[PDB]
Amino acid sequence: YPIFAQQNYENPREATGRIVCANCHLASKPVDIEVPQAVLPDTVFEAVVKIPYDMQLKQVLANGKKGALNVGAVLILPEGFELAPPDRISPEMKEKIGNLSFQNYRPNKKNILVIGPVPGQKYSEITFPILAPDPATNKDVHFLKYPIYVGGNRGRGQIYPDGSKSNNTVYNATAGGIISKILRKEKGGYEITIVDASNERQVIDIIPRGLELLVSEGESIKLDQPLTSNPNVGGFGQGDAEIVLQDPLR
């Protein structure tokens, strides 16, 4: 979620250029962003982000059941640019943004906006109302070409903020050997007993519900060999745009 990155990452873009959602959102999927080639000082413009995915896809929800995906995004604007105020947003644009609440990554970062989780069926494309700054009223803002970075995600992530894996990822064998027993649990989930004949050790790997096994009893498994299918149908992607803060003269 956009709150996990905000809660323990002061800046959402790392030195490699990767947005911090890719640390838990491990599948890569395309994100698009359309921005006007140039904008004038103190004018509202729209940054439309597209997080496309096949909508007949059903992901594994946190309780094993399958459901639809939710979308979320982080927009990194240049310093001076910020969310347009409600009095400056047109009525033809207010119906376009639906009723989304864009939050600041942090109260001091007014140029980084986050939104989500919001339902993917309704918000695969999101419109961010941005207000262009004015160089005559801001000495660090100039008429220049500015970079815009966006991070778009659809579907549940694989790792939580404590390092724990979710049930929306592959479960690998913690030991090599032969599966001597597979206990199918009453309310869903499995208990796999692996006899590591090489180390004379017995280990039990537990698999959560919503995942189907790829192994049978008596099969030889290697360390880190995938014991279940990959139930992730979502993914994170990033894109960038260039906007020209234009002088109203020439």
Binding site: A62, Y160, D162, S166, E186, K187, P208
Partner: protein
């Protein structure tokens, strides 16, 4: 016992998240911050024979206003793992022990 859904600083967590109660004692989960929220008991992580539908909200049900509460009384002894369906990945999880 009263448990807040969302900390006073807007953190996505149950306060408290780990606690013990006597059998028949009521737990009042109240919407505090970061809602909507809901309380779902893990059917595979509660005492054997307990019906999770009798002590949890539906995964599709939500408390979306400040002050909304969900109350439940547990009688069977053992450990009960619960979580918020939309914020389970955030770490909004908890465990109650009926002793």
């Amino acid at each position: 016992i009263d448990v807040l859904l969302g900390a006073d600083d807007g953190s996505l967590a149950f306060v408290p998240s780990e606690f013990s109660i006597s059998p028949g004692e009521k737990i009042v989960f109240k919407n505090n911050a970061g809602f909507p929220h809901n309380i779902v008991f893990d059917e595979d992580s509660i005492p054997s024979g307990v019906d999770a539908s009798k002590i949890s909200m539906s995964e599709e049900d939500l408390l979306n206003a400040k002050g909304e509460t969900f109350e439940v009384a547990l009688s069977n002894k053992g450990e009960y793992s619960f979580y918020c369906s939309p914020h389970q990945g955030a770490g909004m999880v908890g465990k109650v022990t009926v002793n």
